[PDB]
């Protein structure tokens, strides 16, 4: 979604430093408001201490800052943050791999639903659309980016993802629960009807198509599960309390105290707490990692591109089962027909990558 | 890719020490430039303090160094680095196991696509090439090492991985998305056509070949996913900010202060911060682990050898379905035909490894 | 169960702060009683020290508080807590994914059990009910929320999940063990009988239905395993001993000592230990995470909604195999019949999400 994969392909001098200059989906963009509020509260307190407090009040503030500073300890924050963010990242990738792709069903429907006639074409196209509909229905239930594009079931119809008859049949089935599973049932019935009409040879080929359907259903279920079962609220609150406890301590504890009073640890007054602000970006930015990935189907820069996926799948799906049904290129003899040990060429820049075969660690390299 | 597996086979005296003398894919090669910049910035600051600053300025620098040194804390860096590098290492191995291997399809196509005639040969060879093409297409999309070898679809054709007719059919199919999935559809269609021509006996055998194809498609999808879905940028920036914050503190904090002033902790002046430089190799090298494996398909020393894999797969693939179709050695009686409990020999060096059968922990060893 | 997924969809200013104002399934609701007892014991001790102890006794208390405070170390608690809570969270999600869903069997039974006559209808409905019964039986064995709804096998019958004849057959089978597996056997027998009556065409389709049944059985087994095999008691006691040891130390160690005596670290008297109470919410709330998820089938706010699942599954199950058996909508040509590269519309708010196809990191974006 914010892909920088090609920038970090090699481990060169500025592989990671270069990324500090990027704004899209960056730490600056996510921390902006929070950082400013921190900056303000800090320098506000700083001026109150330098310009308002009396000599006697300043002595109390200095004693209060020493108290607060002794409680700004990251080690407990690092512990709970690391674990929580690890949990979020785990679910984040699991949710991605749970986005259903048509390609596996697409391959079977394209080759095993017979007929080069309009009905065979309508049959194959309708089967794929039942798959894409099972997906679009669940995606608009879990993704705010998709829902805002299909806010009502009418949008789904007008977008060409569901026919008005299907919508009628959809409404006809009375159920109080999410009907995303309906197209998945239609598919199995239509696949069986297709087999009875002789469009699907065996039951082995039919069950094979039914299996890939069931797999797609399990994908939609996983998406439903992660949307329904949030990370327990108590856990989320714990990590924000811990993080905020730290920044609360820093607000006062990290104040630059009087250099003249010579407090151990506060010998220099820089006015601006460089390292405390660097700690804020670290921990507030670290919390923002979880903050952004806790729901990867939202509208964040790094949230999944669910609407593009829908478009790509629609185009590719139909194309593979229609224009490509039993449509192959001209079979030719391959360029290595009479060559048992082909030696495919290398460009000038890639010849260093033509390596001898790795036989095993145990063998002597001679 | 940089395999030292045989060197670390045994846990001897210098099993790991020996590896500190290796340059290829080493910590020295990856840290070289960064270390020099650190070295320079350090000793530059060191000379400014020893030779330029006035007695009064030196006192401020010493107070500034005590401030910076109090913020060079590795514990928070260790937390975020360990977690981040673990995530990178996790994806690193997942991407490797996502590199498709022909061997499973290779075994089925070689034995279940009938015919010892030129067509049967062309059929089997074309089926394998559709698999290898599905792979090469995705590999050149995710690997810079491969792309620089196949920068254009013409390179793929001229290299013998795609026929010009296939390229024509390829172009004929209008789609704005990556067509790496095309050969995977052709395969299923060609496998079905082969079955209708009587070259594949049952549908059980056909579905079995279609399944191994779908698995290969899922492999290509995983590669696409890891290339598309980068580790969230904010997370990457967080760990570089944390690491750099530490080295910023060390640049000044780890300066050798005046021994005469007798600062607690700074009683000895060695001019060269041995342990601080050793800490740099540790953390900068630890960050380089993630820096190198975050994209294992690049051109790093330890990045995957994707071009060799392509070559090996091409050679082995065709060879197994052509020269090896229904081609077996002469069936003989095995050397242990009349021996129910064979006792295979051992070399002189390996006799210590002939052990009695492990029956279970519960049994008395007598 | 306490779903806030939509609130945390985007990483905005108050994404996580907002959740601190929520009561249901919150840290406040789970810690309430414990916190009050801590508060009381603390201020109780505080008053005894300020108002009861003599000048000589106060000096001992101050020496005792310095001793206790030196043992309030979070680092060892963070270690064991983080690990333990991670184990609980791991099992927590594994148990969720082990809750059986009818949808996969539902799809096969609806399309592969032939007959539009009352028997075909009774056959399909009875097959699904044998599945839902296998589930309801195990759920009421592991979930207190479900058991309190089906305390006796009569409740199961009167609720319409088991017929009185089935209950008679149930009792007839003499076994001292949990009979949740019985309906799962009936299903396989009824599925075979259905095939012999010609209601299930092939064995390929029959084995396919038997496989999805076995999968559901494995789901029930996982639920049984997690209920039977608790997290080892010694481990649970260890983490509570560690946590309580910390709060025991804090009860005395974190007392506000005499400011006049000028103890290093105790220069300011605030009467209320703000940061110690913030540490209590952190660790006591962190322990409550494990405390709540160690049995996700209980009656906690964030415990699974097992009774709703039963209701939803009952409704959807029967509906898909009865009203939807071979019942499809009118096949129409799709809106993109003559459009090879469809461009589904976007709402005004979602047009920014229409992206160009991601081809791969290696390709030049031009």
């Amino acid at each position, epitope marked *: 979604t914010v892909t920088y994969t090609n920038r970090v392909a090699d481990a060169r001098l500025g592989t990671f430093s270069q990324l500090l200059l990027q704004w899209k989906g960056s730490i600056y963009k996510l921390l902006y408001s929070e950082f400013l509020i921190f900056i303000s509260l800090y320098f506000a307190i700083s001026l109150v201490y330098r310009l308002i407090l009396s000599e006697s009040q300043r002595l109390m503030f200095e004693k209060l800052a020493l108290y607060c500073n002794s409680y700004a300890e990251l080690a407990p924050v690092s512990a709970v943050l690391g674990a929580y963010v690890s949990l979020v990242v785990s679910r984040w990738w699991a949710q991605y791999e749970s986005i259903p792709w048509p390609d596996r069903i697409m391959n079977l429907v394209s080759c095993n639903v017979d007929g080069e006639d309009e009905y065979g074409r309508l049959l194959r196209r309708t089967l794929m659309r039942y798959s894409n509909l099972c997906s679009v229905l669940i995606l608009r239930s879990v993704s705010t980016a998709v829902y805002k594009r299909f806010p009502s079931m009418e949008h789904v119809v007008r977008a060409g993802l569901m026919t008005p008859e299907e919508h009628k049949k959809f409404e006809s089935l009375n159920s109080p629960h999410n009907k995303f599973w309906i197209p998945c049932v239609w598919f199995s019935n239509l696949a069986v009807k297709a087999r009875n009409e002789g469009r699907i040879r065996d039951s082995v080929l039919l069950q094979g198509i039914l299996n890939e359907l069931n797999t797609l259903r399990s994908q939609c279920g996983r998406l439903y599960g992660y949307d329904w079962i949030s990370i327990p609220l108590v856990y989320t609150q714990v990590v924000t309390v811990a993080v905020y406890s730290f920044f609360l301590a820093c607000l006062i504890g990290r104040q630059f105290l009087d250099p003249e009073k010579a407090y151990p640890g506060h010998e220099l007054d820089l006015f601006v707490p460089v390292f405390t602000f660097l700690q804020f970006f670290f921990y507030a930015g670290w919390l923002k990692v979880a903050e952004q990935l806790i729901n990867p189907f939202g509208e964040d820069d790094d949230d999944f591109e669910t609407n593009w996926l829908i478009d790509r799948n629609l185009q590719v799906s139909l194309m593979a089962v229609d224009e490509m049904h039993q449509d192959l290129p001209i079979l030719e003899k391959d360029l290595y027909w009479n060559e048992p040990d082909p030696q495919p*060429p*290398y460009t*000038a820049a890639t*010849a260093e990558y033509k390596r001898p075969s790795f036989l095993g660690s145990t063998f002597d390299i001679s | 890719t940089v395999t030292y597996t045989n060197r670390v086979a045994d846990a001897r005296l210098g099993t790991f020490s020996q590896l500190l003398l290796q340059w290829k894919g080493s910590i020295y090669k990856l840290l070289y430039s960064e270390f020099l910049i650190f070295i320079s910035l350090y000793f530059a600051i060191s000379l400014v303090y020893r030779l330029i600053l006035s007695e009064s300025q030196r006192l401020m620098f010493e107070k500034l160094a005590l401030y910076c040194n109090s913020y060079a804390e590795l514990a928070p860096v260790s937390a975020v680095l360990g977690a981040y590098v673990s995530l990178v290492v996790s994806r690193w191995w997942a991407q490797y196991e996502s590199i498709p291997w022909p061997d499973r399809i290779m075994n089925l196509v070689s034995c279940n696509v009938d015919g010892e005639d030129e067509y049967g040969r062309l059929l089997r060879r074309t089926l394998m090439r559709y698999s290898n093409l599905c792979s090469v297409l995705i590999l050149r999309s995710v690997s810079t090492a491969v792309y620089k070898r196949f*920068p254009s679809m013409e390179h793929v054709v001229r290299a013998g991985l795609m026929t010009p007719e296939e390229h024509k059919k390829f172009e004929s199919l209008n789609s704005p998305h990556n067509k790496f999935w095309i050969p995977c559809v052709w395969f299923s269609n060609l496998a079905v056509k082969a079955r209708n021509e009587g070259r594949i006996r049952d549908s059980v055998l056909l579905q079995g070949i279609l399944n191994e194809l779908n698995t290969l498609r899922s492999q290509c999808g995983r590669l696409y996913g890891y290339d598309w879905i980068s580790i969230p940028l904010v997370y990457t920036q967080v760990v570089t900010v944390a690491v750099y914050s530490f080295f910023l503190a060390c640049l000044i904090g780890r300066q050798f202060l005046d021994p005469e002033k007798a600062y607690p902790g700074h009683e000895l002046d060695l001019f060269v911060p041995v342990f601080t430089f050793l800490q740099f190799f540790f953390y900068a090298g630890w960050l380089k682990v993630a820096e190198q494996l975050i994209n294992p398909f690049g051109e790093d020393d330890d990045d995957f050898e994707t071009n060799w894999l392509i070559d090996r797969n091409l050679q082995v693939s065709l060879m197994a379905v052509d020269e090896m179709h229904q081609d077996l050695p002469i069936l003989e009686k095995d050397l242990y035909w009349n021996e129910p409990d064979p006792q295979p020999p051992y070399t002189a060096a390996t006799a210590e490894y002939k052990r009695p059968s492990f029956l279970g922990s519960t049994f008395d060893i007598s | 169960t306490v779903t806030y997924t939509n609130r945390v969809a985007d990483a905005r200013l108050g994404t996580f702060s907002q959740l601190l104002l929520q009561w249901k399934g919150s840290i406040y609701k789970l810690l309430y009683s414990e916190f009050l007892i801590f508060i009381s014991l603390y201020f109780a001790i505080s008053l005894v020290y300020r108002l009861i102890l003599s000048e000589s006794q106060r000096l001992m208390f101050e020496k005792l508080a310095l001793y206790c405070n030196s043992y309030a170390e979070l680092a060892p608690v963070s270690a064991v807590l983080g690990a333990y809570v991670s184990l609980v969270v791991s099992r927590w999600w594994a148990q969720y994914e082990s809750i059986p869903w009818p949808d996969r069997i539902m799809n096969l039974v609806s399309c592969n059990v032939d007959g539009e006559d009352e028997y075909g209808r009774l056959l399909r409905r009875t097959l699904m009910r044998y599945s839902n019964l296998c589930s309801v039986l195990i759920l009421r064995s592991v979930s207190t929320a479900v058991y309190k709804r089906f305390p006796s096998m009569e409740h199961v019958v009167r609720a319409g999940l088991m017929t009185p004849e089935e209950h008679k057959k149930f009792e007839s089978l003499n076994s001292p063990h949990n009979k949740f597996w019985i309906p799962c056997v009936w299903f396989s027998n009824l599925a075979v009988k259905a095939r012999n009556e010609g209601r299930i065409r092939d064995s390929v389709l029959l084995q396919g239905i038997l496989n999805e049944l076995n999968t559901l059985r494995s789901q029930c087994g996982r639920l049984y395993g997690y209920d039977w095999i608790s997290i080892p008691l010694v481990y649970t006691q260890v983490v509570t001993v560690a946590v309580y040891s910390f709060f025991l130390a804090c009860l005395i160690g974190r007392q506000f000592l005499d400011p006049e005596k000028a103890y290093p670290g105790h220069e300011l008297d605030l009467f209320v230990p703000v940061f110690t109470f913030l540490q209590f919410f952190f660790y006591a709330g962190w322990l409550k995470v494990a405390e709540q998820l160690i049995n996700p089938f209980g009656e906690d706010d964030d415990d699974f909604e097992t009774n709703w699942l039963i209701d939803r599954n009952l409704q959807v199950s029967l509906m898909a195999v009865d009203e939807m058996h071979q019942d499809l909508p009118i096949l129409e040509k799709d809106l993109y019949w003559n459009e090879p590269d469809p461009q589904p519309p976007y709402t005004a708010a979602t047009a920014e999400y229409k992206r160009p196809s991601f081809l791969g990191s290696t390709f030049d974006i031009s």
Partner: antibody
Amino acid sequence: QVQLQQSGPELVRPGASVKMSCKASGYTFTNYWMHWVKQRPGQALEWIGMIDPSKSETTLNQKFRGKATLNVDKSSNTAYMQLSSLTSEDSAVYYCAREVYYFDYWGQG
Amino acid sequence: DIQMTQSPASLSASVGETVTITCRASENIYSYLTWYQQKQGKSPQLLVYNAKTLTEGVPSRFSGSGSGTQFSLKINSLQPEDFGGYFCQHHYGTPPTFGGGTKLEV
């Protein structure tokens, strides 16, 4: 049709610098590496270097390290080569060729 | 670097004849060799690539062979057009050095 149109002939005084062009057309500029060859009468063709149009990665010949410079303009589909500290020996015919495991299209020179 | 040694420096033959130019590699270059034809004043043109494969326009009378370190171009049944310059180039690595050349005169 693939066509590599280079700049016109040049005349400079020793020590100066020159920058010749090569405009490609009829194929995707960024998908083929561009090479530069030096042709002197009586000597064999010398390989100066190559350039990756996409990322402007240059790979020169050690023999031309300080003499030649490569860069491209993806927008105008043209490649450039700059020769510095020109001497009498830097006088020759300079080609730009497209690579596809071979040099299948050269410029006029 | 890989050294390309071409021979003969110049061959003289008349129409109808069949000549054979030879390029020898300093080290193994597998099948990575190309043959170019260059007529005085014009820019070179690709004849054979990948050691054996003829390019588009090349007539059947041209054929290449060899592998490893020994390659050869063979022009059977000469024509008037076939008179001019001929050189080889290896394509195994960087820099892709060229051959000395061969002047084919009448």
